């Protein structure tokens, strides 16, 4: 039913959407796995019944991050709200969302801007504090018979300015902020 505290249904699509790590020989050699984050996220989108043409890098993305200063110089707050709304309405339709993240902290190479993606697969709240579950393809670690990147502690928290920020379970140094929402394409003939 609807939650008393946050007024929305809590959602957890994980039991219907198989996880995929990028560190998988299906993506090729180590050098190919090293750049396979987007490809593994796309496997997750097709595991959820979406078109393999989903999430193109084109002008349909919602671009939240833009290139002595304020902390919010590179965040378009209207786009942040749009991306949030699109995430809510896809999850309520039963679909995950592939999003691009930047590092507040814990970048593996601060000298570069290597693209990284995660897939949002759920939503809940603690005392009206909204959180979103995500799959982290950027880990091969396993625990309790499952991949760490499928664990429920992969959580983004909704901030007051409507940005999504959080930490993956396999690497407590990484602090993500969601900077780009990519679009789902349904499996339709026309």
């Amino acid at each position: 039913g609807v939650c008393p505290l946050c007024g929305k249904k809590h959602i957890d699509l994980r039991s219907k959407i198989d996880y995929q790590t990028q560190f998988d020989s299906r993506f090729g050699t180590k050098k190919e796995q090293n750049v396979a984050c987007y490809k593994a996220c796309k496997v997750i989108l097709t595991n959820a019944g979406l078109s393999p043409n989903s999430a193109p890098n084109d002008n349909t993305v919602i671009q939240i991050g833009v290139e002595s200063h304020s902390s919010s110089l590179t965040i378009d707050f209207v786009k942040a709200s749009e991306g949030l709304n699109y995430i809510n309405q896809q999850l309520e339709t039963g679909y995950p969302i592939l999003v691009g993240v930047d590092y507040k902290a814990g970048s593996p190479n601060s000298d570069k801007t290597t693209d990284h993606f995660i897939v949002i697969v759920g939503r809940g709240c603690k005392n009206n504090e909204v959180y979103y579950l995500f799959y982290e393809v950027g880990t091969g670690q396993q625990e309790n018979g499952q991949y760490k990147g499928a664990h429920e502690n992969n959580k983004l928290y909704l901030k007051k300015d409507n940005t999504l920020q959080g930490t993956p379970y396999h690497n407590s140094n990484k602090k993500y902020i969601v900077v780009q929402i990519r679009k789902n394409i349904l499996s339709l003939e026309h």
Binding site: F23, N34, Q142, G145
Partner: protein
Amino acid sequence: RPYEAIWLAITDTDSGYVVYNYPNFQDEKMIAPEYVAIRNDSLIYATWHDYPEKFSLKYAKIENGNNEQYSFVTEYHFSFMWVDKEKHIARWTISDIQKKKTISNYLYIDSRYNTFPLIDYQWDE
């Protein structure tokens, strides 16, 4: 305890076997070969794509088979077997705990006897 050593993963190349040295996916400044190291109560499982995992063996399930084969279950299933005991080369077959998918089954050299070159792996082909 024949498995008790720092086992460095080797890779066969066109120019012979090497020990590749990887900048980690999580942190390019952390540069190390892949390895499995067993010293007393610890089993360290270190890959190129994640931080090393150092398991306490007091919580592991440890079995010995024939001919100096051994297995260890922590969050993964590790099976040790000699491949060329005189060259101090062994194989670690590493599987998920369900033993359904094999993760890797590299050859390894005991670091005390290693003569292969340590070659810094270059991600940007």
